[PDB]
């Protein structure tokens, strides 16, 4: 799987994260990220994908050791953590053929797992529009505890 890079952008209170909503297979909400190009450095891919999807340039705020990285089905996704971005920042994708909407979400209200269907005695998970974000929520909460308190 080709690795993906992007960012977890938080506001100044550390309460809210910035998610983007795509189309079709990417119809739910997730952190801005995308596939690394041949010979492209991780930090440069993260800034490019984030700038293409949000219009916000993270390059001057990226800290090299501040990221969460997950291997999901043998694909690596690494999101650089970018705190302190003002809530009134104007975000605009380059490509509205790819991005429907861009919003702040309260971290404490985002789920960190999908719910089962044990009310229905059926296996599997109910749909959740935050599916792609979910795997990063607990690790992010733990990372913010250790880094900030
Ligand atoms: C069931 O898994 C498929 C799925 N993927 C997604 C998804 O990535 N949404 C966020 C997003 C990130 C970057 C973009 F450019 C566009 C959208 N939502 O559902």
From Swiss-Prot:
Expressed in brain and testis. Not detected in heart (at protein level). Residues 1-131 form the Nudix hydrolase domain. Mn(2+) binds at residues 49, 53. It is found in: Cytoplasm, P-body; Nucleus. It comes from the Eukaryota. Phosphorylated at ser-249 in a MTOR-dependent manner. A motif (Nudix box) lies at residues 34-55. Decapping metalloenzyme that catalyzes the cleavage of the cap structure on mRNAs. Removes the 7-methyl guanine cap structure from mRNA molecules, yielding a 5'-phosphorylated mRNA fragment and 7m-GDP. Necessary for the degradation of mRNAs, both in normal mRNA turnover and in nonsense-mediated mRNA decay. Plays a role in replication-dependent histone mRNA degradation. Has higher activity towards mRNAs that lack a poly(A) tail. Has no activity towards a cap structure lacking an RNA moiety. Found in a mRNA decay complex with LSM1, LSM3, LSM4, EXOSC2, EXOSC4, EXOSC10, PARN, XRN1, CNOT6, UPF1, UPF2 and UPF3B. Forms a complex with DCP1A, EDC3, DDX6 and EDC4/HEDLS, within this complex directly interacts with EDC4/HEDLS. Interacts with DPC1B. Interacts (via N-terminus and C-terminus) with TRIM21 (via N-terminus and C-terminus). Associates with polysomes. Interacts with LIMD1, WTIP and AJUBA. Interacts with DDX17 in an RNA-dependent manner. Interacts with ZC3HAV1. Interacts with APOBEC3G in an RNA-dependent manner. Interacts with ZFP36L1 (via N-terminus). Interacts with NBDY. Belongs to the Nudix hydrolase family. DCP2 subfamily. This is m7GpppN-mRNA hydrolase. The gene is DCP2. The chain holds residues 96 to 244 of 420 of the full protein.
């Amino acid at each position: 799987g080709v690795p993906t890079y992007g960012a977890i952008i938080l506001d100044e209170t550390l309460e809210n994260v910035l998610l983007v909503q795509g189309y079709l297979a990417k119809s739910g909400w997730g952190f801005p990220k995308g596939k690394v190009n041949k010979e492209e450095a991780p930090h440069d891919c993260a800034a490019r994908e984030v700038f293409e999807e949000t219009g916000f340039d993270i390059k001057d705020y990226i800290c090299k050791d501040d990221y969460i990285e997950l291997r999901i089905n043998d694909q690596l996704a690494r999101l650089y953590i970018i705190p302190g971005i003002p809530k009134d920042t104007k975000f605009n994708p380059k490509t509205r053929r790819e991005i429907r909407n861009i919003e702040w979400f309260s971290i404490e209200k985002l789920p960190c797992h999908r719910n089962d269907m044990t009310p229905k005695s059926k296996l599997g998970l109910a749909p959740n529009k935050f599916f792609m974000a979910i795997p990063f929520i607990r690790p992010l909460r733990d990372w913010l505890s250790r880094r900030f308190g």
